[PDB]
Amino acid sequence: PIVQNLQGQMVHQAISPRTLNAWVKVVEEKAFSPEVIPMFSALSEGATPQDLNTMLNTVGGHQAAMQMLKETINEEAAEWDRLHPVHAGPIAPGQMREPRGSDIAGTTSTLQEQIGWMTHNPPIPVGEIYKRWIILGLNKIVRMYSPTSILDIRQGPKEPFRDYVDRFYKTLRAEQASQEVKNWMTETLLVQNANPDCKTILKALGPGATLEEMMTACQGV
Amino acid sequence: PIVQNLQGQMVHQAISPRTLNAWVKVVEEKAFSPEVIPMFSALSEGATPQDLNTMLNTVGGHQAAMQMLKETINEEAAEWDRLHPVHAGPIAPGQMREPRGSDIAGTTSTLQEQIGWMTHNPPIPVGEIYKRWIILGLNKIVRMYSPTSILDIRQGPKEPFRDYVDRFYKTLRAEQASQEVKNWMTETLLVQNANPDCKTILKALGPGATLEEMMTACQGV
Ligand SMILES: O=P(O)(O)O[C@H]1[C@H](OP(=O)(O)O)[C@@H](OP(=O)(O)O)[C@H](OP(=O)(O)O)[C@@H](OP(=O)(O)O)[C@H]1OP(=O)(O)O
Secondary structure (H helix, E strand, O other): OEEEOOOOOEEEOOOOHHHHHHHHHHHHHOOOOOOHHHHHHHHOOOOOHHHHHHHHHOOOOOHHHHHHHHHHHHHHHHHHHHHOOOOOOOOOOOOOOOOOHHHHOOOOOOHHHHHHHHHOOOOOOHHHHHHHHHHHHHHHHHHHHOOOOHHHOOOOOOOOHHHHHHHHHHHHHHOOOOHHHHHHHHHHHHHHOOOHHHHHHHHHHOOOOOHHHHHHHOOOO | OEEEOOOOOEEEOOOOHHHHHHHHHHHHHOOOOOOHHHHHHHHOOOOOHHHHHHHHHHHHHOHHHHHHHHHHHHHHHHHHHHHOOOOOOOOOOOOOOOOOOOOOOOOOOOHHHHHHHHOOOOOOOOHHHHHHHHHHHHHHHHHHOOOOOHHHOOOOOOOOHHHHHHHHHHHHHHHOOOHHHHHHHHHHHHHHOOOHHHHHHHHHHOOOOOHHHHHHHOOOO
16 A cells, blocks of 8 residues: 655555455465455555565465466566567656566566556556456456356256355356356346256246346245 | 330230249149248239139149139129129220129130220229139138148147147138137137147246247247
């Protein structure tokens, strides 16, 4: 985080040990359930790339996943570097050097330049692009850790409908696809994969039946 | 048919050989299934009654069918004679005479007469009336040659609903009862005769359901 001192100049503030330990416990306990992404984005609000690096390195276990995240961050940094070629020439006192692909990731940047980049007007959000790369990696990790694809979620012969819907929507949350495909999956795959006992009821209800109506109608079975 | 020559005068043009060939194929191979009527009504596009008789001689091979067709033509001609009593008196020399029930049927008329009748301002259609009588006869023949009654169209244990609906509608179009009985058949007899699973879904769907919703809800069963 970045805060203003008494004089009003921006000063970095280290993350409290409570937040850091909460994030570490979330990563080590939850495996990589899909709710880690919102929790991470809530715990890392307006943080400098050094803070993100601390929040990532501090994790003790799940080292394979952190390695995959390292690979994804490196690929995104290389692509960004290719997109922005270096402008040769001395930097005027009124500006600062343009951050390269690895300057964003914090492997070759000091704290002061990172503070200066996004506190400048107009701002260049190093933190908000680094967090985008990290979240893009976490999406792949979460998708990998989820057991089964959405197309293989099937209600058992005896399973209650509420548990089946819970499994289906957990898997769909873990799924990686655009929003339109997710809407189609919600509309059709839910009815299509049900057990024979509830499939007839769901078809008889109609094509525009809301989730509440389906679950209250299939409550007994 | 009727065409305009190089001098702007309407002149009869004979039916091309392959159109008569197509009609002969329709008569001899379709076994008077309910689709003979649309194909006749297509092949006889704007034909003077001489061409209608030329196409009709093909049915002369079937003794019973031609007898039914001739009886219906004669009955409609008698009704036409009754409803249009011949007026005795002088007529404007710029107008043609009046077509008798045996002159709209091309039995006692010449080609120039029918050309003048059809190419008139306002036109007096003889081809269309003759075609309507022929279609009445063909409706009677198609009804006679039906293979099964509407009450015997029952979906099989595993026949898809689409095939059953197509069979049912073909049989209903052959039998051609009145309109209200047709609506009652479509609404109720269609649901009644279905196989147990589709019957269950259709009953649970509700009463007064359009065909689209029935076929959409009963798609994969
Ligand atoms: O009554 P037909 O002698 O068999 O005439 C047909 C007819 O031509 P017209 O109606 O212009 O006389 C076809 O026209 P369609 O209405 O089917 O389109 C045409 O076929 P094209 O459409 O391909 O022109 C075909 O011509 P073709 O011989 O090139 O197949 C031609 O048959 P004839 O040429 O033997 O008269």
